Specification:
Blueprint lengths: L25 H14 L9 H15 L24 E6 L12 E6 L8 H5 L12 H10 L3 H4 L1
Antiparallel strand pairs: 1-2
PDB class: viral protein
Keywords: Nef, accesory protein
Assembly: monomeric
């Protein structure tokens, strides 16, 4: 590897998997969506922050994906994937998870093949994309504050 690896004064050891790192593309997101679907990893599985991390770590291990792609829209309601090509959304379960979610909803993962062609997250919640929202900074602020997302607006 790089010559830094031969530093006798090198401190610690990297906990990063020995895979070449890469950013989640639409292509990779489609492939990983179908892989997870075929393996049965997520369909109808209750959402949790720990399972969110497990998936991030798993995809970095197997495919070197840098784990900053799995962002879903804030909600409440269906939480749409903000990385276009990821075919998995979070769906509120109406009982007759809850402590993780800022809106207090019970959420479950759901496969949606229409997410390969419709960028639902950007269509419905452009304000959650900041400077890439296609809206003025003040309109981003207005829409976020109206939804109660003051931290995101700031």
């Amino acid at each position: 590897g790089p010559i830094d690896e031969e530093d006798d004064d090198l401190v610690g050891v990297s906990v990063r998997p020995k895979v070449p790192l890469r950013t989640m593309s639409y292509k990779l997101a489609i492939d990983m969506s179908h892989f997870i679907k075929e393996k049965g990893g997520l369909e109808g599985i209750y959402y949790s922050a720990r399972r969110h991390r497990i998936l991030d770590i798993y995809l970095e291990k197997e495919e070197g994906i840098i784990p900053d792609w799995q962002d879903y829209t804030s909600g409440p309601g269906i939480r749409y994937p903000k990385t276009f090509g990821w075919l998995w959304k979070l769906v509120p379960v109406n009982v007759s998870s809850q402590w993780d979610d800022p809106w207090g909803e019970v959420l479950a993962w759901k496969f949606d093949p229409t997410l390969a062609y419709t960028y639902e997250a950007y269509v419905r919640y452009p304000e959650e994309f900041g400077s890439k929202s296609g809206l003025s900074e003040e309109e981003v602020r207005r829409r976020l504050t109206a939804r109660g997302l003051l931290n995101m607006a700031d």
